[PDB]
Amino acid sequence: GSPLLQQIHNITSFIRQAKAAGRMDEVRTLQENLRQLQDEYDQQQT
């Protein structure tokens, strides 16, 4: 739970910063990293 949530918080922040700097490749790969970790977090709780 909580450690995974920390990772999720951090990738979410990195996506915000990458969008603000107009770095598209970085945004798209990080969005896929986030999507995979969010499913892992949800399944562990589900």
PDB file of N, CA and C in Angstrom:
ATOM      1  N   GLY A   1       0.805  -1.251   0.000  1.00  0.00           N
ATOM      2  CA  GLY A   1       0.000   0.000   0.000  1.00  0.00           C
ATOM      3  C   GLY A   1       0.820   1.275   0.000  1.00  0.00           C
ATOM      4  N   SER A   2       1.218   1.725   1.189  1.00  0.00           N
ATOM      5  CA  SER A   2       1.797   3.061   1.377  1.00  0.00           C
ATOM      6  C   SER A   2       3.080   3.336   0.582  1.00  0.00           C
ATOM      7  N   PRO A   3       4.020   2.374   0.538  1.00  0.00           N
ATOM      8  CA  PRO A   3       5.193   2.569  -0.327  1.00  0.00           C
ATOM      9  C   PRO A   3       4.838   2.749  -1.814  1.00  0.00           C
ATOM     10  N   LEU A   4       3.926   1.924  -2.327  1.00  0.00           N
ATOM     11  CA  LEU A   4       3.446   2.054  -3.711  1.00  0.00           C
ATOM     12  C   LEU A   4       2.777   3.406  -3.941  1.00  0.00           C
ATOM     13  N   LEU A   5       2.008   3.867  -2.959  1.00  0.00           N
ATOM     14  CA  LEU A   5       1.356   5.169  -3.058  1.00  0.00           C
ATOM     15  C   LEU A   5       2.383   6.307  -3.141  1.00  0.00           C
ATOM     16  N   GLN A   6       3.490   6.175  -2.415  1.00  0.00           N
ATOM     17  CA  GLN A   6       4.587   7.143  -2.492  1.00  0.00           C
ATOM     18  C   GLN A   6       5.153   7.216  -3.913  1.00  0.00           C
ATOM     19  N   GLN A   7       5.389   6.050  -4.513  1.00  0.00           N
ATOM     20  CA  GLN A   7       5.863   5.961  -5.900  1.00  0.00           C
ATOM     21  C   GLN A   7       4.877   6.617  -6.856  1.00  0.00           C
ATOM     22  N   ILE A   8       3.591   6.334  -6.666  1.00  0.00           N
ATOM     23  CA  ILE A   8       2.523   6.925  -7.476  1.00  0.00           C
ATOM     24  C   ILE A   8       2.480   8.456  -7.329  1.00  0.00           C
ATOM     25  N   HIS A   9       2.583   8.957  -6.096  1.00  0.00           N
ATOM     26  CA  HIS A   9       2.660  10.408  -5.859  1.00  0.00           C
ATOM     27  C   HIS A   9       3.815  11.025  -6.654  1.00  0.00           C
ATOM     28  N   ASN A  10       4.960  10.353  -6.620  1.00  0.00           N
ATOM     29  CA  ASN A  10       6.167  10.867  -7.255  1.00  0.00           C
ATOM     30  C   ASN A  10       6.079  10.872  -8.779  1.00  0.00           C
ATOM     31  N   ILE A  11       5.600   9.786  -9.387  1.00  0.00           N
ATOM     32  CA  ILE A  11       5.453   9.761 -10.853  1.00  0.00           C
ATOM     33  C   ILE A  11       4.442  10.820 -11.294  1.00  0.00           C
ATOM     34  N   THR A  12       3.373  10.983 -10.524  1.00  0.00           N
ATOM     35  CA  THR A  12       2.369  12.012 -10.812  1.00  0.00           C
ATOM     36  C   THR A  12       3.004  13.416 -10.832  1.00  0.00           C
ATOM     37  N   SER A  13       3.854  13.706  -9.851  1.00  0.00           N
ATOM     38  CA  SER A  13       4.580  14.983  -9.811  1.00  0.00           C
ATOM     39  C   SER A  13       5.537  15.143 -10.992  1.00  0.00           C
ATOM     40  N   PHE A  14       6.254  14.078 -11.349  1.00  0.00           N
ATOM     41  CA  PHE A  14       7.173  14.128 -12.497  1.00  0.00           C
ATOM     42  C   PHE A  14       6.429  14.370 -13.821  1.00  0.00           C
ATOM     43  N   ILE A  15       5.235  13.800 -13.971  1.00  0.00           N
ATOM     44  CA  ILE A  15       4.407  14.060 -15.155  1.00  0.00           C
ATOM     45  C   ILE A  15       4.005  15.547 -15.224  1.00  0.00           C
ATOM     46  N   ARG A  16       3.626  16.127 -14.086  1.00  0.00           N
ATOM     47  CA  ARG A  16       3.240  17.546 -14.038  1.00  0.00           C
ATOM     48  C   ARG A  16       4.406  18.444 -14.461  1.00  0.00           C
ATOM     49  N   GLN A  17       5.598  18.125 -13.973  1.00  0.00           N
ATOM     50  CA  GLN A  17       6.781  18.910 -14.303  1.00  0.00           C
ATOM     51  C   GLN A  17       7.183  18.749 -15.774  1.00  0.00           C
ATOM     52  N   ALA A  18       7.067  17.528 -16.301  1.00  0.00           N
ATOM     53  CA  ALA A  18       7.416  17.240 -17.699  1.00  0.00           C
ATOM     54  C   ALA A  18       6.444  17.906 -18.679  1.00  0.00           C
ATOM     55  N   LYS A  19       5.161  17.938 -18.326  1.00  0.00           N
ATOM     56  CA  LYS A  19       4.176  18.667 -19.126  1.00  0.00           C
ATOM     57  C   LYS A  19       4.496  20.170 -19.132  1.00  0.00           C
ATOM     58  N   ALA A  20       4.826  20.722 -17.964  1.00  0.00           N
ATOM     59  CA  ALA A  20       5.141  22.153 -17.833  1.00  0.00           C
ATOM     60  C   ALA A  20       6.361  22.568 -18.656  1.00  0.00           C
ATOM     61  N   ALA A  21       7.287  21.630 -18.863  1.00  0.00           N
ATOM     62  CA  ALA A  21       8.486  21.856 -19.680  1.00  0.00           C
ATOM     63  C   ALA A  21       8.317  21.407 -21.137  1.00  0.00           C
ATOM     64  N   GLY A  22       7.133  20.923 -21.502  1.00  0.00           N
ATOM     65  CA  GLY A  22       6.856  20.511 -22.879  1.00  0.00           C
ATOM     66  C   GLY A  22       7.674  19.325 -23.361  1.00  0.00           C
ATOM     67  N   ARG A  23       7.872  18.336 -22.490  1.00  0.00           N
ATOM     68  CA  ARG A  23       8.676  17.150 -22.819  1.00  0.00           C
ATOM     69  C   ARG A  23       7.771  15.938 -23.071  1.00  0.00           C
ATOM     70  N   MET A  24       7.327  15.780 -24.317  1.00  0.00           N
ATOM     71  CA  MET A  24       6.250  14.840 -24.658  1.00  0.00           C
ATOM     72  C   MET A  24       6.631  13.361 -24.514  1.00  0.00           C
ATOM     73  N   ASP A  25       7.808  12.972 -25.005  1.00  0.00           N
ATOM     74  CA  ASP A  25       8.226  11.573 -24.908  1.00  0.00           C
ATOM     75  C   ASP A  25       8.263  11.127 -23.448  1.00  0.00           C
ATOM     76  N   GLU A  26       8.834  11.977 -22.593  1.00  0.00           N
ATOM     77  CA  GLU A  26       8.915  11.726 -21.147  1.00  0.00           C
ATOM     78  C   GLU A  26       7.526  11.615 -20.524  1.00  0.00           C
ATOM     79  N   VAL A  27       6.635  12.534 -20.884  1.00  0.00           N
ATOM     80  CA  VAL A  27       5.260  12.471 -20.388  1.00  0.00           C
ATOM     81  C   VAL A  27       4.606  11.127 -20.738  1.00  0.00           C
ATOM     82  N   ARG A  28       4.707  10.679 -21.993  1.00  0.00           N
ATOM     83  CA  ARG A  28       4.012   9.447 -22.412  1.00  0.00           C
ATOM     84  C   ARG A  28       4.567   8.174 -21.769  1.00  0.00           C
ATOM     85  N   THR A  29       5.887   8.062 -21.636  1.00  0.00           N
ATOM     86  CA  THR A  29       6.450   6.878 -20.987  1.00  0.00           C
ATOM     87  C   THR A  29       6.120   6.865 -19.492  1.00  0.00           C
ATOM     88  N   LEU A  30       6.235   8.019 -18.824  1.00  0.00           N
ATOM     89  CA  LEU A  30       5.844   8.124 -17.404  1.00  0.00           C
ATOM     90  C   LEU A  30       4.351   7.826 -17.184  1.00  0.00           C
ATOM     91  N   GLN A  31       3.490   8.255 -18.104  1.00  0.00           N
ATOM     92  CA  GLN A  31       2.062   7.946 -17.978  1.00  0.00           C
ATOM     93  C   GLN A  31       1.802   6.438 -18.019  1.00  0.00           C
ATOM     94  N   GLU A  32       2.574   5.706 -18.821  1.00  0.00           N
ATOM     95  CA  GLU A  32       2.462   4.248 -18.874  1.00  0.00           C
ATOM     96  C   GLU A  32       3.024   3.589 -17.604  1.00  0.00           C
ATOM     97  N   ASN A  33       4.116   4.123 -17.059  1.00  0.00           N
ATOM     98  CA  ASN A  33       4.633   3.656 -15.767  1.00  0.00           C
ATOM     99  C   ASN A  33       3.597   3.812 -14.656  1.00  0.00           C
ATOM    100  N   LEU A  34       2.980   4.993 -14.603  1.00  0.00           N
ATOM    101  CA  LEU A  34       1.927   5.295 -13.623  1.00  0.00           C
ATOM    102  C   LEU A  34       0.747   4.336 -13.755  1.00  0.00           C
ATOM    103  N   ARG A  35       0.290   4.112 -14.990  1.00  0.00           N
ATOM    104  CA  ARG A  35      -0.874   3.251 -15.250  1.00  0.00           C
ATOM    105  C   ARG A  35      -0.645   1.835 -14.711  1.00  0.00           C
ATOM    106  N   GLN A  36       0.541   1.296 -14.963  1.00  0.00           N
ATOM    107  CA  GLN A  36       0.902  -0.037 -14.483  1.00  0.00           C
ATOM    108  C   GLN A  36       0.973  -0.110 -12.951  1.00  0.00           C
ATOM    109  N   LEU A  37       1.581   0.894 -12.307  1.00  0.00           N
ATOM    110  CA  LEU A  37       1.694   0.903 -10.843  1.00  0.00           C
ATOM    111  C   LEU A  37       0.341   1.110 -10.167  1.00  0.00           C
ATOM    112  N   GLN A  38      -0.529   1.914 -10.777  1.00  0.00           N
ATOM    113  CA  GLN A  38      -1.861   2.131 -10.219  1.00  0.00           C
ATOM    114  C   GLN A  38      -2.678   0.840 -10.223  1.00  0.00           C
ATOM    115  N   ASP A  39      -2.551   0.028 -11.269  1.00  0.00           N
ATOM    116  CA  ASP A  39      -3.260  -1.255 -11.297  1.00  0.00           C
ATOM    117  C   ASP A  39      -2.730  -2.194 -10.214  1.00  0.00           C
ATOM    118  N   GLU A  40      -1.412  -2.219 -10.027  1.00  0.00           N
ATOM    119  CA  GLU A  40      -0.824  -3.024  -8.958  1.00  0.00           C
ATOM    120  C   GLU A  40      -1.345  -2.599  -7.581  1.00  0.00           C
ATOM    121  N   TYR A  41      -1.406  -1.289  -7.340  1.00  0.00           N
ATOM    122  CA  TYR A  41      -1.919  -0.761  -6.067  1.00  0.00           C
ATOM    123  C   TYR A  41      -3.391  -1.140  -5.867  1.00  0.00           C
ATOM    124  N   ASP A  42      -4.206  -0.947  -6.904  1.00  0.00           N
ATOM    125  CA  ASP A  42      -5.643  -1.240  -6.827  1.00  0.00           C
ATOM    126  C   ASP A  42      -5.906  -2.730  -6.583  1.00  0.00           C
ATOM    127  N   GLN A  43      -5.166  -3.596  -7.275  1.00  0.00           N
ATOM    128  CA  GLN A  43      -5.349  -5.043  -7.131  1.00  0.00           C
ATOM    129  C   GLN A  43      -4.974  -5.531  -5.725  1.00  0.00           C
ATOM    130  N   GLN A  44      -3.922  -4.957  -5.145  1.00  0.00           N
ATOM    131  CA  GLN A  44      -3.510  -5.299  -3.782  1.00  0.00           C
ATOM    132  C   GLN A  44      -4.573  -4.898  -2.749  1.00  0.00           C
ATOM    133  N   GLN A  45      -5.318  -3.832  -3.040  1.00  0.00           N
ATOM    134  CA  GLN A  45      -6.406  -3.367  -2.172  1.00  0.00           C
ATOM    135  C   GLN A  45      -7.724  -4.081  -2.489  1.00  0.00           C
ATOM    136  N   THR A  46      -7.886  -4.508  -3.741  1.00  0.00           N
ATOM    137  CA  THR A  46      -9.113  -5.166  -4.200  1.00  0.00           C
ATOM    138  C   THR A  46      -9.140  -6.637  -3.798  1.00  0.00           C
TER     139      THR A  46
END
